[PDB]
Design an enzyme around this catalytic site. Structure first.
Site, mmCIF file in Angstrom:
data_model
loop_
_atom_site.group_PDB
_atom_site.id
_atom_site.type_symbol
_atom_site.label_atom_id
_atom_site.label_comp_id
_atom_site.label_asym_id
_atom_site.label_seq_id
_atom_site.Cartn_x
_atom_site.Cartn_y
_atom_site.Cartn_z
ATOM 1 N NE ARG A 175 82.359 47.916 28.794
ATOM 2 C CZ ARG A 175 83.026 47.412 29.845
ATOM 3 N NH1 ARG A 175 84.354 47.573 29.968
ATOM 4 N NH2 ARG A 175 82.348 46.740 30.803
ATOM 5 C CE1 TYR A 226 83.169 67.825 13.311
ATOM 6 C CE2 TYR A 226 83.986 66.446 15.111
ATOM 7 C CZ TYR A 226 82.928 66.968 14.380
ATOM 8 O OH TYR A 226 81.638 66.626 14.695
ATOM 9 C CG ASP A 250 91.059 63.005 12.148
ATOM 10 O OD1 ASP A 250 90.731 62.296 11.158
ATOM 11 O OD2 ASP A 250 90.208 63.541 12.915
ATOM 12 C CE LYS A 302 81.989 62.712 9.093
ATOM 13 N NZ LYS A 302 82.363 62.247 10.438
HETATM 14 C C1 4LM Z 1 79.326 65.732 11.254
HETATM 15 C C2 4LM Z 1 80.731 65.264 11.577
HETATM 16 C C3 4LM Z 1 81.866 65.661 10.848
HETATM 17 N N1 4LM Z 1 83.133 65.233 11.162
HETATM 18 C C4 4LM Z 1 83.448 64.401 12.097
HETATM 19 C C5 4LM Z 1 84.898 64.111 12.336
HETATM 20 C C6 4LM Z 1 85.332 63.452 13.497
HETATM 21 C C7 4LM Z 1 84.470 62.929 14.491
HETATM 22 O O1 4LM Z 1 83.912 61.690 14.009
HETATM 23 P P1 4LM Z 1 82.419 61.135 14.391
HETATM 24 O O2 4LM Z 1 81.385 62.053 13.936
HETATM 25 O O3 4LM Z 1 82.391 61.076 15.864
HETATM 26 O O4 4LM Z 1 82.299 59.768 13.786
HETATM 27 C C8 4LM Z 1 86.698 63.242 13.648
HETATM 28 N N2 4LM Z 1 87.564 63.681 12.749
HETATM 29 C C9 4LM Z 1 87.192 64.370 11.619
HETATM 30 C C10 4LM Z 1 88.235 64.859 10.617
HETATM 31 C C11 4LM Z 1 85.848 64.574 11.425
HETATM 32 O O5 4LM Z 1 85.460 65.226 10.287
HETATM 33 C C12 4LM Z 1 81.830 66.669 9.678
HETATM 34 O O6 4LM Z 1 82.769 67.476 9.507
HETATM 35 O O7 4LM Z 1 80.872 66.719 8.886
HETATM 36 C C1 4LM Z 2 81.071 41.725 32.013
HETATM 37 C C2 4LM Z 2 80.414 43.013 32.510
HETATM 38 C C3 4LM Z 2 79.575 43.065 33.655
HETATM 39 N N1 4LM Z 2 79.016 44.223 34.128
HETATM 40 C C4 4LM Z 2 78.961 45.357 33.539
HETATM 41 C C5 4LM Z 2 78.364 46.492 34.308
HETATM 42 C C6 4LM Z 2 78.567 47.819 33.890
HETATM 43 C C7 4LM Z 2 79.225 48.170 32.676
HETATM 44 O O1 4LM Z 2 78.362 47.846 31.561
HETATM 45 P P1 4LM Z 2 78.884 47.513 30.034
HETATM 46 O O2 4LM Z 2 79.509 46.197 30.045
HETATM 47 O O3 4LM Z 2 79.817 48.593 29.646
HETATM 48 O O4 4LM Z 2 77.664 47.503 29.164
HETATM 49 C C8 4LM Z 2 78.029 48.848 34.679
HETATM 50 N N2 4LM Z 2 77.384 48.617 35.818
HETATM 51 C C9 4LM Z 2 77.201 47.326 36.313
HETATM 52 C C10 4LM Z 2 76.469 47.124 37.644
HETATM 53 C C11 4LM Z 2 77.714 46.281 35.556
HETATM 54 O O5 4LM Z 2 77.553 45.025 36.039
HETATM 55 C C12 4LM Z 2 79.378 41.892 34.647
HETATM 56 O O6 4LM Z 2 79.474 42.086 35.891
HETATM 57 O O7 4LM Z 2 79.072 40.754 34.257
HETATM 58 S S H2S Z 3 79.071 68.338 14.050
HETATM 59 S S H2S Z 4 84.664 42.521 31.871
#
Ligand code: 4LM
Ligand code: 4LM
Ligand code: H2S
Ligand code: H2S
Ligand code: 4LM
Ligand code: 4LM
Ligand code: H2S
Ligand code: H2S
Lengths: 392, 392, 398, 392
Positions: free
Chosen positions: B55, B108, B180, B205
């Protein structure tokens, strides 16, 4: 109602709808096309069953979501890119400036950081309450109390919360209860059946089981999950889960019952071993008769889990020596892997806390956290044995 | 400096450091282990180079990030689960209550929704300005103006801003410019080399190019990107990119120059065709000499792009009939895929806007948007030709 | 319009052929059927699929929808009736030859073959009673004179790996029609974008899809294209029972992804190699250079006649032999030292100690594989960078 | 020596050798580069220990191979594209015209077809013999006998071979004993420890456990495995396993012990149930005290397995009705999946046999084969019960 194992394998999928495929096809596609623009318009307006864009919804994700909803006993599920994606998407949706959120005393480090340095700096008020003390919580309720959020057991000291008691109080004041069920999984605890409104997971952990994906799940009512999908995820986080990772997560869930049975049996033996040892100052394990909240743990959890927290005499000095001597256990953060892991919360997973914040939120400087894996118990006992001897 | 195509294939990777592997191994792992707990603690304190948790950072993701930073000519990159992940992670980290963000007139749809119904409801002030009108931008600058955010060309009407001219004004007043660059890619436009501080992409895209992943990218200075990584991504969105999807994105990036050259050459032919047709009322394509900002387009973009917007004489009725008649083009949102796509922004990508907001920010009913794909141009022209007959 | 019976262009088919999003919930990219088995609504329906009366699916080693799409698309690009996808190029070659040949049959072979193909023939199937004969497939009179009543298969590569010897595919096919032999062409080097042996009269084509078809060096795969009858036989005997060389659906999806840019990649490979070959032909250290795009290429007119562009591969020799070849290859900094070809990355290798190490020293001199031969697979990098790298390495080889 | 479950998770991998990656990075690469051409020439000669081409060898595949070798107690392993890949690569390497292969009386359909209609038509002689009958096997040996090949238990009637007894006989003539161990896996039976030279697997089945890959494994002595790799695989089949699939197979292997325990426990309950039912004529399950080879089974297998074959009194007609009434079991070939499956061998897995060969080699019309999955036994029981009701 088919059993848990049956539903973990089959729920929401019939091979006969996808050309007989026994394993559901993986919809690794960003977008979906429409037979007419009117059909498409209808999808966007929200008045149509279907699919348009994988950030909003995707059939591989939808199957994972329905299956997770079934296991937790909730109406609807949502899959996200990480546990933090699930928590942030949820809380960004349910809170606005001047709302209050009541928190459990001890939180996962990035959850703490998000609350205090993230959403807390955008006008949302935070207060910490011991969530096993129903009187102290009731006293803390204000008319601005919108959300109650906690982990049970808590990362990393294993403090329980009285989920049903919290929920009664939240029902009275019109508060939404959100429970991080990462440590138990739906196989061991179902906070929705105890009155929680939403559950969140780091599916990265036990649910995946094999340490190869990062993912998050939200489960709850249709009304709350729809809002979290269409606001938190769509617009405020973009924490979209890959269909590839979702299919791996589903693959993991098929063995969740078997894996959790073994994590629990191994961890019970290691805990009972660590209890008998002179080097050990104290242990937090729910399955030890001596656990402070043993009774509450048993009313909520069907088994005592895979996680052990403990301190050595020698403090952090002996902690380092123990951890550095481990040869089968690995030194790493994370949990719920097939591999057994050990870590030091103060300097690692809870290093976002200051030393004073660590001190009065119950994160000891001597604490060692074990994620007990699926290896042979005798090999794991031998490794812990020799690391204790090296720690002296 | 090796050429663009060379860097898109090779930058940041030497097969000799990974057992001779010509393609980099995929690090499909959530966690990394430590030889000692002090090594681990040092990693968490920033004082040691290494990995701990995907992450935060992952070696497959880091190669993607370094390669994208090189292509945009920036210092550091960050990979996220979606374009919205990139945008939200960026803005949540850079802004706080009382800050002002100046916005391009047209954005967008989910970006608009994020700004007005997300971060704008947490006390951040928004104002829209015509970024092509440098006097009006100057007139709108205040001391509370922290961020200038825009797309160029803008989704969906192709309106342009003079990035260097905007950057000058930002430098004078002390604001951060976020561009962007989704539509152009670093192959056609590099806003960092014209004074912008950060560039964001929907890598979903053109960068992917093949419609099979959702991803986002942020590029800028080490200092800004580190903050976005450690605050926006880590704590406020959890929009983590799968290593599997990162690997696919890098695969797509290897043919970016070839694909964009074809997208552009196809779109130019199509635009010139459309400009001569009796059913077409207006067309916005930057490579047409009739484009209002033609000189600025030729100055700032090395090619005019794969995207066309136009209006049919018969308004929304004719638009619907046109889009319904397409047999080779598909009706879908998204863009920059091998497959040619068409959509109706007012009912789809910009349906989060109200009718008043669409009229105010330049998204008409009547507007059709084409993402011109990599199919043989004669086939695309015959499909458009028959759909135009059908539009009447 | 000029009518809907017009074949869509190559690029259009490489992207679209065989797939309509509306048949899979609108998914723009086809879903990946990463499943070993398929279930039946009834036992009778299932018995019908093993019989072969019910159209459908039961087991991915025999057949799978992701693989079937890939197969139909490759069949379209080659101009064949049917396709088959396999785990590797060798999978395609072996599955094909094990199906077509039995003890007593003779196979006539091109004078030069990929090393593992040579080894399979001489040390594999050749040891189970199948007779082998090598012939110069550029010499149509020699081919005619080598035909016997036992000749069942004629098998060759064109251009050949690694010396780029060519055959006249239409000329070979004509001899094969008259005598009654099945013609099998390995079309790995050209791809269907540059050459289509089935349209010149071959019965079957085989590919290492690991190379240009994939384009990105991340999968191993094979393809066979030909008549429905021959491809069905290869599927149900060669693949099912004699090799088990099953392609992963994950990899088939990646291969399809690569095929979507095949035209664009091949254009650039070819333009890069042309500039590089002309550059190398003018350099002091070069003994000989074989590139189909140079008039010095021994079968230049045959190349122009069969191949629409001259390819991405260069074979050449420095003055200095083995000795100088070693020092050139070792000073390369952008090119990598590696086997394989048709990757985005430019590669350089030494057939005699690498891809043709399986041949004895004698067999290498007899089948036209010199000791000083240096093979280049020209990639997709900026031509100025590749020229600079080859220029500095030539200097260091002096 | 660490226990089975420990080795199935850890054997051959130390995270510290790969930047700490807890899960091994996936080497999805066809080729490997050389720092010098001398080094390259040495790899092809076998003098240097690196990598060159994934058809020959690949680090992900090698890890899988070493782990399977450890689980079976063998020197060396080889990973292939399928079970048929493993069988054919093995037999093509070891046999030449005039050699004889002695075969178990009942074989999986494609193995039988390979033998009779493939390698058997290239001058290799075939003889079928009962491999529990040691005096018949002794009598069947000839100077031409070079391989003894069988499955135990045999797909689909569960007939056992006396592996130690066969190996004693083979040893007197220097013959190579090859056992298909697909049904048992190394968790339940280890033929190399009973004296076999080579074991083959369809890793598609229990080893994967999740029905999502096709794969094969060979394990044996270094010299034999080396030749199968360099002749059978490299030159005669090209049955190359994808690194992606090899990685999934390793993921499946980490729960092999837990899954096999559950498959066996479920199958034991269903067998006990089916053996008492009036609709059932005959049942083959090794765990039943009445199984003809109960004592021999218990000498070789640590648990009786997840497969059951049985016959209904109404013959083929009752068989059909039973199968069509199943709602939780799927009708499909394959086995060793999380999902329970049922099939009719005569018209499916053994349809490559003629009627007279089926009758001769112990494959009845009327036989139903069950692959008992991981679902809740009470659900599986209900499904089999109602299907038995519908059959009569
Ligand atoms: C279906 C989505 C379209 N666009 C998205 C988009 C995003 C947002 O990006 P994610 O879709 O979250 O990867 C950010 N910035 C720009 C200039 C974008 O065109 C579309 O227009 O067709
Ligand atoms: C290195 C990360 C650990 N934990 C994460 C965690 C998250 C957050 O989950 P993502 O890591 O974002 O999938 C949410 N909720 C609980 C009770 C968690 O333990 C860890 O402790 O070992
Ligand atoms: S969208
Ligand atoms: S972490
Ligand atoms: C390292 C391998 C090289 N060639 C391979 C190849 C194969 C065999 O193809 P798989 O490797 O089995 O996909 C078949 N046919 C031809 C004309 C080939 O070039 C190489 O030379 O660089
Ligand atoms: C549909 C296939 C089934 N069997 C396969 C199989 C193979 C051949 O394995 P691949 O399918 O090539 O991985 C080898 N050895 C044994 C004991 C097998 O059962 C089945 O029975 O249901
Ligand atoms: S090779
Ligand atoms: S089969």
């Amino acid at each position: 109602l088919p059993g848990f194992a049956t539903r973990a394998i089959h729920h929401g999928y019939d091979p006969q709808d996808h050309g007989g495929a026994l394993v559901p096809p993986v919809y690794q596609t960003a977008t979906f096309t429409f037979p007419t623009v009117e059909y498409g318009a209808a999808c966007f307006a929200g008045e149509q069953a279907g699919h348009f864009y994988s950030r909003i919804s995707n059939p591989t994700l939808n199957l994972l979501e329905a299956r997770m909803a079934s296991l937790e006993g909730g109406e609807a599920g949502l899959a996200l890119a990480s546990g933090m994606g699930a928590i942030t998407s949820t809380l960004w949706t349910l809170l606005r400036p001047g709302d209050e959120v009541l928190l459990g005393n001890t939180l996962y480090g990035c959850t703490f950081a998000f609350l205090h340095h993230g959403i807390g700096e955008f006008g949302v008020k935070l207060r910490h309450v011991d969530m096993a003390d129903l009187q102290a919580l009731e006293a803390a309720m204000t008319p601005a109390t919108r959300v109650i959020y906690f982990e049970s057991p808590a990362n990393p000291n294993m403090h329980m919360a009285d989920i049903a008691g919290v929920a009664k109080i939240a029902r009275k004041h019109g508060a939404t209860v959100v429970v991080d069920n990462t440590y138990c999984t739906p196989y061991l605890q179902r906070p929705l059946e105890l009155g929680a409104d939403l559950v969140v997971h780091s599916a990265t952990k036990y649910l995946s089981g094999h340490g190869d994906i990062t993912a998050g799940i939200v489960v709850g009512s249709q009304a709350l999950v729809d809002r979290i999908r269409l606001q938190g995820l769509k617009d405020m986080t973009g924490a979209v889960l890959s269909p590839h990772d979702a299919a791996l997560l589903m693959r993991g869930i098929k063995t969740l019952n078997l894996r959790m049975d073994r994590h629990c049996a191994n961890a019970q033996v290691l805990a009972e071993f660590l209890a008998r040892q002179p080097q050990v100052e104290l242990i937090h394990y729910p399955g030890l008769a001596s656990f402070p909240q043993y009774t509450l743990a048993r009313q909520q959890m069907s088994q005592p889990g895979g996680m052990i927290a403990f301190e050595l005499k020698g403090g952090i000095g002996a902690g380092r020596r123990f951890m550095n001597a481990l040869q089968l256990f690995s030194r790493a953060v994370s949990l719920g892997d097939a591999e057994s892991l050990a870590q030091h919360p103060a300097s690692m997973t809870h290093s976002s806390y200051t030393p004073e914040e660590r001190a009065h939120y119950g994160i000891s400087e001597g604490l060692v956290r074990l994620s007990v894996g699926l290896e042979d118990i005798d090999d794991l006992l031998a490794d812990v044995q020799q690391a204790l001897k090296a720690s002296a």
